[PDB]
Amino acid sequence: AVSVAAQKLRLALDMYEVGEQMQRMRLGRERPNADVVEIEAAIDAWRMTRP
Amino acid sequence: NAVESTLRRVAKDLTGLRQRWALVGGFAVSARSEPRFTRDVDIVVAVANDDAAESLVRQLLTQQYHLLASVEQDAARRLAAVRLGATNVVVDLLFASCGIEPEIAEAAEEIEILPDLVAPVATTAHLIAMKLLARDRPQDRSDLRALVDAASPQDIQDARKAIELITLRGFHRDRDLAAEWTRL
Amino acid sequence: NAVESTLRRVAKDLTGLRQRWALVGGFAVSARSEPRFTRDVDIVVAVANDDAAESLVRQLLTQQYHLLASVEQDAARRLAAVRLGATAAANVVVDLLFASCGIEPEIAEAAEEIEILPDLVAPVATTAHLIAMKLLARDDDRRPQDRSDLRALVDAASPQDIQDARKAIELITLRGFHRDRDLAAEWTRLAAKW
């Protein structure tokens, strides 16, 4: 008994996680010599920026 | 999931502070219409004036939020919004961005999103009004199209009334929102 | 994660069926620029003819996909696209595009294998082909994401990407898939407003 609105919001949360992982993979490609910590730092900077 | 964690934490914090609040933005749009990739958590908070908004922000800075940005404006409510970070994801708190924050919080519907995650979510009609005003940030046009496609006849009339109220309070930034609404 | 689960499954299924395919639409854009996507996973499949398209869809219907819609047109390639549900409006769906833009064989041939998620390597349409497809699909009234995807793609585009987008538009038009529009002129007018 999850509402339709709740189902759609749960899907959007899944979408965020996929988009974060896609951004992480792309940054790794664009910055091949970047260590894990540097990539995560880039991921953290990414969220903080406006649309 | 960084957003889920942020939503859970800000929901508990705003509720612990007995605030009048509602989820807006991309997650509310997703709930009311078509889900989309969203990374900002945007929340309307109804407070009486800048002093009250500032007091809430000051309290949240003592609960492991930090101030990323503040949106000032030349109006009676000098504080339209603040952007806060976790000390995970950005949270924008909207106090006086559209001028109907009290109505948005009052009309929002509590939704149990996941276990132990409950949030008031703005109505379709109020999201339509917000997204019409904010139209510029290209995702607003897409959100607006989705909301209108999902809207009932009553949602449409309710959006009309919300937009009239934005204009009556002087938050319409010199635009004819009523005319823009006739076209949607 | 229902989005991840569906992406991994459809990629595995189309590759297992040895199809000539490429990720397009928002998920492809999101592999090359800031993420922007909805529940629709859009994929170009290059097939020989309508019979081959229908045979692939029939095969996927035996692999737990459900047909939601078929897009047809008055053309020799009658079947432009199908919409498949992978589960029972909060559902991830798959759009297979067979003859929507007319350069599906070229799109699949030029597609680049990219690890879009960990251990998920998929052919992703080139930026050039994504630009050409977004210009063609562009409907500012009903699909504003197409115009915003366009700004992002053109900004992400290398000189090669720009040249190949122009060539792709020309081939769409030569084949008569341009819907009586001047896509290059539309691009110029839109990009002036950038």
Residue numbers in the entry:
A (entry chain C): 2 to 52
B (entry chain B): 2 to 88, 94 to 142, 146 to 193
C (entry chain A): 2 to 89, 92 to 197
Publication excerpt:
Members of the MenAT family of TA systems in M. tuberculosis encode a toxin with a conserved nucleotidyltransferase (NTase)-like protein domain (DUF1814) and a cognate antitoxin, which can belong to different protein families. We show that MenAT1 can function as a bona fide TA system in vivo in its native host M. tuberculosis. Furthermore, the toxin MenT1 acts as a tRNA NTase in vitro, which transfers CMPs to the 3ʹ end of tRNA acceptor stems without preference for specific tRNAs. MenT1 biochemical activity was fully inhibited by purified MenA1.
